[PDB]
Description:
The complex is a heterodimer of chains A (102) and B (238). In chain A, 10% of the residues lie in helices and 31% in strands.
Amino acid sequence: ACVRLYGPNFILQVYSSQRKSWHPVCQDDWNENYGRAACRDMGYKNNFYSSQGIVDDSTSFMKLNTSAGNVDIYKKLYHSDACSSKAVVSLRCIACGVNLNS
Amino acid sequence: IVGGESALPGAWPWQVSLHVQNVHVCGGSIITPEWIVTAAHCVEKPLNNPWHWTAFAGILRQSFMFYGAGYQVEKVISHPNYDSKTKNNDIALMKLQKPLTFNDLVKPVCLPNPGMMLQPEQLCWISGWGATEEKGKTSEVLNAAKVLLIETQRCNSRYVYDNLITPAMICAGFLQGNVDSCQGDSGGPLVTSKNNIWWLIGDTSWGSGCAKAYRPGVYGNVMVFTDWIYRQMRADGE
Lengths: 102, 238
Ligand SMILES: *[C@@H]1O[C@H](CO[C@@H]2O[C@@H](C)[C@@H](O)[C@@H](O)[C@@H]2O)[C@@H](O[C@@H]2O[C@H](CO)[C@@H](O[C@@H]3O[C@H](CO)[C@@H](O)[C@H](O)[C@H]3NC(C)=O)[C@H](O)[C@H]2NC(C)=O)[C@H](O)[C@H]1NC(C)=O
Ligand SMILES: *C(=O)c1ccc(NC(=N)N)cc1
Ligand SMILES: [Ca+2]
């Protein structure tokens, strides 16, 4: 699993060694429970804050395979040129980054 | 902090004071109820073992950090590539035995994501209980100051740090001096606001003297360590 949250809007991305490129995750079939699994893979234990679809500011996407078994969430993604939902996953694992003036 | 101002309650709610033998030694930054980012230099032997360390959160004044009310540190993890000679890869994690209670005065800073697209001279803040003058004593009060990032090419120039600034380091402050981190602030945060979120850009690491001209602060480049942090947090208990 080579994964990242990208940018100030927390775009979830997966690396392709073949393409030497990072790809966002299509919001297709995604939900907060997948959000929680991704957060656990990033070491956040029982922290979770939000998972929502956003417009992507990349062509190629990672798409969730709903017909996969109980495997790790990143083994459930595959390469797709198309995202039917036209949105990508924005994932926040913890409420952070607020202070007196926020 | 040299040339800063007293912090307000809840301005820097991720800032902790890290004590050994009942006194402040280093700063750190809260990233989860149990995890703190600090500097590897702080935890060199003979202070590598967690038993030495307690963390104080949500408290501005050292005299209100009472013996026995700190959070005991359970685990210390120094970056595998830390080099004490050069201070390269100067980052460590501390895990608390008991999780902190977040409130208006205690809360986490966000780890920086790849692709932050910061400005070359992004406006940042540093905070801590360091000396307020070179060779000074620990500050009783938490201070903070605005600093700008200094482009690595400038910081590595012959008249500044002459090729000592690696990709795991970032410079911040002012080349005229006067506003800077100092002894006691190390391990603590360098933060910036972007998209209405405060991000941990750096951890206070080293510099020649404090607040001297052409001798700005050098910070661990937390962006480059985030994946290591994730992996340590994930490994813990597993
Ligand atoms: C979504 O997942 C389906 C279920 O596959 C399982 O879970 C995924 C996550 C992965 O671990 C798979 O290895 C695992 O089986 C995918 O359907 C499977 O597709 C594979 C081909 O990639 C297929 O493997 C063949 O199995 C036969 C039977 O023994 C074997 O003889 C062949 O050598 C394999 N074929 C090839 C290409 O050599 C497997 O049988 C499929 N499993 C099922 C239950 O049908 C599905 O492809 C995937 N969806 C997408 C869009 O990729
Ligand atoms: C850590 O305690 C520390 C970091 C940096 C300095 N020097 C400067 N910022 N110049 C001193 C001490
Ligand atoms: Ca020891």
